Amino acid sequence: GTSKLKYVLQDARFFLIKSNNHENVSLAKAKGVWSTLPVNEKKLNLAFRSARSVILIFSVRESGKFQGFARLSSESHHGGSPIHWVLPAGMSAKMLGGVFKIDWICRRELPFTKSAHLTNPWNEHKPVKIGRDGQEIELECGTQLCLLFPPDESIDLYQVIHKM
């Protein structure tokens, strides 16, 4: 069903995450972690304290798809288990410092063709697929977007609900 998912998304905040490669999204799916640039890290840390749920919706550049979505379970933390992110040009491990823990809600893909009816008020009402890494997605648009994804029957939202 979709009732627990709707409960997790109630009064949530949503942010678009753009990754330059699939490798980092695969690593994030396997390890339950994400790292972003310091400008976005500050925004996510502020959002984490402000809302019952902060949802990251992931899209790999040039893929034409979203690769899933996840809920922040912590603010960013430094030190500890390092992450072998595949770093683009100019990208360094020090900028990808600060690791957030995340709980995946859906690890399935959604093609951009399926979200063409959803526009984001916080990005000039452009289609929600359009946006820089870190772009906030307004509540109603983000909720509809998450509900478009195929259900991920490998995930039990019971443990997610308890963290709220």
Side-chain angles (χ1 to χ4, degrees), residues 1-30 32-51 53-61 63-74 76-80 82-90 93 95-100 102-113 115-131 133-139 141-164:
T2 66
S3 299
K4 285 199 292 290
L5 174 58
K6 286 165 159 186
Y7 180 86
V8 169
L9 297 183
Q10 172 79 209
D11 298 298
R13 295 180 71 175
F14 306 84
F15 295 87
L16 180 64
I17 299 292
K18 290 279 171 79
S19 178
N20 273 13
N21 55 67
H22 278 287
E23 280 68 35
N24 291 347
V25 172
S26 172
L27 214 50
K29 282 177 176 176
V33 294
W34 190 243
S35 299
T36 187
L37 282 316
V39 166
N40 287 335
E41 181 181 358
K42 288 175 184 92
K43 307 198 334 172
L44 289 186
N45 279 329
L46 279 167
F48 182 76
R49 306 157 191 153
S50 78
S53 284
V54 177
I55 305 297
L56 304 189
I57 308 177
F58 286 83
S59 180
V60 176
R61 275 261 142 76
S63 67
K65 299 171 182 157
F66 304 96
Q67 280 71 38
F69 61 101
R71 181 182 176 285
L72 291 185
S73 62
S74 80
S76 68
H77 288 104
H78 296 254
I83 321 283
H84 296 82
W85 304 116
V86 191
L87 315 167
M95 325 193 308
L96 292 191
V99 173
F100 296 87
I102 62 177
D103 289 316
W104 286 86
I105 300 175
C106 179
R107 290 187 176 87
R108 307 272 308 266
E109 296 185 313
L110 180 75
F112 287 169
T113 51
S115 58
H117 62 292
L118 297 181
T119 58
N120 182 6
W122 300 151
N123 193 25
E124 306 186 345
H125 288 274
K126 295 176 167 152
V128 64
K129 75 178 182 197
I130 307 295
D133 180 57
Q135 169 69 58
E136 191 165 357
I137 303 167
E138 177 273 333
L139 170 74
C141 180
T143 300
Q144 286 182 279
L145 178 53
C146 289
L147 291 176
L148 285 176
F149 279 80
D152 186 341
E153 287 153 20
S154 68
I155 287 179
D156 189 344
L157 292 182
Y158 173 85
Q159 292 76 3
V160 181
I161 287 181
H162 279 12
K163 309 184 168 198
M164 297 153 76

Coordinates of all heavy atoms in Angstrom, one line a residue, residues 32 48 54 71-75 100-103 163, unseen atoms left out:
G32 N 24.0 3.6 2.8 CA 23.0 4.4 3.5 C 23.6 5.8 3.9 O 23.4 6.2 5.0
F48 N 17.1 19.5 8.4 CA 17.0 18.3 9.2 C 16.4 18.7 10.6 O 15.5 17.9 11.1 CB 18.3 17.6 9.4 CG 18.2 16.3 10.2 CD1 17.7 15.2 9.7 CD2 18.6 16.4 11.6 CE1 17.6 14.0 10.5 CE2 18.5 15.2 12.3 CZ 18.0 14.1 11.8
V54 N 13.1 14.9 6.0 CA 13.8 15.6 4.9 C 14.1 14.5 3.9 O 14.8 13.5 4.2 CB 15.1 16.3 5.4 CG1 15.8 16.9 4.2 CG2 14.8 17.4 6.4
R71 N 15.3 9.3 3.1 CA 15.1 10.2 4.2 C 16.4 10.4 5.0 O 17.0 9.5 5.4 CB 14.0 9.7 5.1 CG 13.6 10.6 6.3 CD 12.5 9.9 7.1 NE 12.2 10.7 8.3 CZ 13.0 10.7 9.3 NH1 14.1 10.0 9.4 NH2 12.6 11.5 10.4
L72 N 16.7 11.7 5.3 CA 17.8 11.9 6.2 C 17.5 11.3 7.6 O 16.4 11.5 8.1 CB 18.1 13.4 6.4 CG 18.6 14.3 5.2 CD1 18.9 15.7 5.7 CD2 19.9 13.6 4.6
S73 N 18.5 10.6 8.1 CA 18.4 10.1 9.5 C 19.4 10.8 10.5 O 19.3 10.5 11.7 CB 18.5 8.6 9.6 OG 19.7 8.1 9.1
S74 N 20.2 11.7 9.9 CA 21.1 12.4 10.8 C 21.6 13.7 10.1 O 21.4 13.9 8.9 CB 22.4 11.6 11.1 OG 23.3 11.6 10.0
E75 N 22.2 14.6 10.9 CA 22.9 15.7 10.3 C 24.3 15.2 9.8 O 24.6 14.0 10.0 CB 23.1 16.8 11.4
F100 N 26.0 12.4 5.7 CA 24.7 12.2 6.3 C 24.3 10.8 6.2 O 24.6 10.1 5.2 CB 23.7 13.0 5.4 CG 23.8 14.5 5.4 CD1 24.7 15.1 4.4 CD2 23.1 15.3 6.2 CE1 24.8 16.5 4.4 CE2 23.2 16.7 6.2 CZ 24.0 17.3 5.3
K101 N 23.7 10.3 7.2 CA 23.1 9.0 7.2 C 21.7 9.1 6.6 O 21.0 10.1 6.9 CB 23.0 8.3 8.6 CG 24.4 8.1 9.2
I102 N 21.3 8.2 5.7 CA 20.0 8.2 5.0 C 19.4 6.8 5.1 O 20.1 5.8 5.1 CB 20.1 8.7 3.6 CG1 21.0 7.8 2.7 CG2 20.6 10.1 3.5 CD1 21.1 8.1 1.3
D103 N 18.1 6.8 5.1 CA 17.3 5.5 5.0 C 16.5 5.6 3.7 O 15.7 6.5 3.5 CB 16.2 5.4 6.1 CG 16.9 5.2 7.5 OD1 17.8 4.3 7.5 OD2 16.4 5.9 8.4
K163 N 11.6 6.7 13.5 CA 12.6 7.7 13.7 C 12.1 9.1 13.7 O 12.8 10.1 14.1 CB 13.7 7.5 12.6 CG 14.2 6.1 12.5 CD 15.3 6.0 11.4 CE 16.0 4.7 11.5 NZ 17.3 4.8 10.8

